Amino acid sequence: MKRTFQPSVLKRNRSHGFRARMATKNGRQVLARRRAKGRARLTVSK
Amino acid sequence: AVVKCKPTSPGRRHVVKVVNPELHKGKPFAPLLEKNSKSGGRNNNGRITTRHIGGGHKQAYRIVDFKRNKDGIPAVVERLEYDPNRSANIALVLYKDGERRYILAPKGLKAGDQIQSGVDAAIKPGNTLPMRNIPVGSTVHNVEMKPGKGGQLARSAGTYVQIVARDGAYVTLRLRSGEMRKVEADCRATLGEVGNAEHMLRVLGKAGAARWRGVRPTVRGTAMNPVDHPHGGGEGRNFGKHPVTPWGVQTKGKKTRSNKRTDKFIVRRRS
Amino acid sequence: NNRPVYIPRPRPPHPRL
RNA sequence: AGGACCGAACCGACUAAUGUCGAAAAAUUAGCGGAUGACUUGUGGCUGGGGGUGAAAGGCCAAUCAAACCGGGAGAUAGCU
RNA sequence: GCUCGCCGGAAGACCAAGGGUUCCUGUCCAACGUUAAUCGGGGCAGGGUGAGUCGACCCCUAAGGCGAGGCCGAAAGGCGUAGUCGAUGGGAAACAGGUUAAUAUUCCUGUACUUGGUGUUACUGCGAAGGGGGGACGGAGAAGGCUAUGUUGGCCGGGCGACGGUUGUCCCGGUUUAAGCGUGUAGGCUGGUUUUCCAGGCAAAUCCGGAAAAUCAAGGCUGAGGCGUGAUGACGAGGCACUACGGUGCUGAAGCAACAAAUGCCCUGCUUCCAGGAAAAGCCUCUAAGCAUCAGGUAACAUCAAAUCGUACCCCAAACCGACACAGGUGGUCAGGUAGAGAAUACCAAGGCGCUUGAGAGAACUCGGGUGAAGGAACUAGGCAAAAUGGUGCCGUAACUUCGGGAGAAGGCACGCUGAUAUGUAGGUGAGGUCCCUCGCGGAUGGAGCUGAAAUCAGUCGAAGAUACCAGCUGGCUGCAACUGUUUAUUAAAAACACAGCACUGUGCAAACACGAAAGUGGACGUAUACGGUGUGACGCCUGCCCGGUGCCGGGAGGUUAAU
RNA sequence: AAUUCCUUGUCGGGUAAGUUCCGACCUGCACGAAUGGCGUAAUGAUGGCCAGGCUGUCUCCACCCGAGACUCAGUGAAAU
């Protein structure tokens, strides 16, 4: 049984990392919404 | 040459090979190579624009000289090579000055032959002449439609066109499709017909032969569902509909030629 | 004290038809 | 030579039994199919929801697919319980 | 601690990915562990990760991403040039031994190597985003030469033994050593050298390419292993002296030969086949601009620098993905002995484990197995499941057929051990000696030694000799599909889908067509022996009649007919 | 007939006994020639039938070896 989640640090960062989010405006809006909600972990990162 | 293999096993039973002994058994000319990454039918948007394309063996692109701009420079034919990109074989040509180029190999071309380009050239097969100099009623290949373009007509294996008429500054060409096209005189053409005329005799033999040739399986519209194809649906192989393309355009006898720009160069249509 | 999150699909019933 | 033969790794999942508040939200045990090829696999990319992909089953698209998921219109509407 | 049992192409040993202290020591047992617990991957504290050479970083690039200008788009934004990113690839350099409770190819000892900066000395024309070469490449197959490694003999050390025999052809253990440097071998590739000329290499060129002659038949390149050095060093059984009794310190003999042999190396090789098998940089070489009492380059010596980050531990699992200390999933490397064709299977070595509830009893019943009188499918929707067949050699082998097949058809016979042929043959390998030598890692002769089938005859044991494990059930008639293949992840693997082939139809290339409000891409760096769509589905014999209807193609008298 | 309502069509083969199977006839409810027709060697974890061998499938079960069930100690659920 190969479950759906197969961790990979490189792919995780390149898909949901800070730089990936800021590249496009919608990701920028996502960061804005996270900041407004005041989440401790703004994004995924080491 | 055409050789039929013995029915040793299924998949090899129906194979019909086309062995060409005079082909070059060695690596090609590296300076003239160029990488050719496959696309799989996808376009810049990443969507499949053309279906049934994908996979296949890796193949490197050979820079083939179609313009043939080296006028007045006799060149010798070093050898013939297999080009995976074309249906016809290509010939490695060495010019008197000492540069090597690739050209389409006509039927009569072989190693050690002499070819030349430009008006100051003979009428031997393989020479490149403008149609104005080429006598009417002769066979040519790799014909241009605009001067300097390079040549687009009659490029496949065993293909050629006829010089049927010469109307002053324009020439009429009868193509292998039965199409009579008016072409500007000054643009160039190559004498003779493309070699490797026995390309039909091959049959590929088995399913996988088409697979590593870059072709993917084709799915009939009937086997599809109603939603994905205009055909499909019903219990027991029901069609009851006029044949159509997957996008609704009615196929099987519906002309799709609508240009109104090049029609002035069309004398007669296919028949 | 989390209430059960994943409830499995019910076992298919016997066909009373 | 071979989409050749027998057969491990590897990939697959035809039969039976067990297991159904199971060891496991499809597995184990004993057999079974392919096993130089249309093969299999690692890494990284591309295709985004009236769309993708599909050797075509309405199959698959994060345990969900005859139209994914999340938030909003939204306290939708419910002559019904 | 002594026994028993299990794994041993793994349930062992090393990595990447992913975890993130789970590592080691002291201490604690409430909670956690499906029981107890002094124990632990649990709690608390301390300790632990050492690099010019390993990896990352770094230089270059693939798919692809982003994208100055630009093109396009109501806005957002889309596409893309120059560029710049992107390892799953290419590019400089280290091995052996020892040491810690826990790190080492990082620390220590020994012996090496690479890339740059600076200085000195002796020579010299240097000089690029520019040219050329190189880097640089597929599948399959075969043989030869080797090594890792193993076996045996010799050698060295120890033992002769609690139940008979065992100083002997006896038994047990050891018989290990690298990178680098030197020599350069089997093998593989290519004929060398000199001179002249040339609109090609978008400029130039002493380089590449091409054309000419003169002269020699040879050089050059690549290249595992072996042999030397490294090394009268290290390691080394064993013995000795003290033990906080875990271990510490001291000493240290032999360290060779033969045979077998890889899936590893020579080999990015070679021979073949069609499906024709990345790119760029480092590197080598030639020049432009410019500089030539310079700078710069080459060779030698000296000196300095090589930063920064990862380094513990798990890594087929109790530490990763599955909510669990879950019978599942997870890529790569090493991979021994006996039997065997084998990485199957059986039993074992090194090594690691007995799977975190036990003790009794020995009912029905359920589960996983063994055996069975006589019958042998009478069971049942159905030979489902079980049972049986099962290997090697030889003999033999039907209908049918596309002449390949069918076929391992079917059906028969022989298989152990010992001796002899032959104090182990044929075969393989091959020392010393002897004869040559374009003189060495050479060639002949020669057979010592070692290894080692198959077959025949004879004898002999058992109920059974392919003795266990492993290891086809077979035949006849017929439906469907030609076949290999693919599919409903998780009740349907099929007659369904695909398929080679065939036919129709569209398309003249700014192609049809598709994705896109568009630009622009795919088709295709293809162009009718090509491409798209549709139907049929190898092959053999064929594929009849009908154009009313609905489509499609062509024509045009007349009628009808929008905007204007 | 993968097609056939009527229907287990009729005759023969196979069985002591055959609504299936194989061959032939044709009253083809409602086969049919590229939504292809008829054949077809080889192939198939394909559908149906027959024979040999084989056996606990069965007549009819019996016994035995293990893991549960049962008793004792510890921990200690669920649906309703």
Author numbering:
A (entry chain 2): 1 to 46
B (entry chain C): 1 to 271
C (entry chain z): 2 to 18
What is written in the article reporting this PDB entry?
Api137 and Api88 differ only in their C-termini, i.e., a free acid versus an amide, which are negatively charged or neutral, respectively, at physiological conditions. To further interrogate the molecular mechanism of Api88, we incubated purified 50S subunits with Api137 or Api88 and subjected the samples to cryo-EM analysis.
Closer inspection of the 50S•Api137 cryo-EM map revealed a highly defined density for Api137 in the PET.
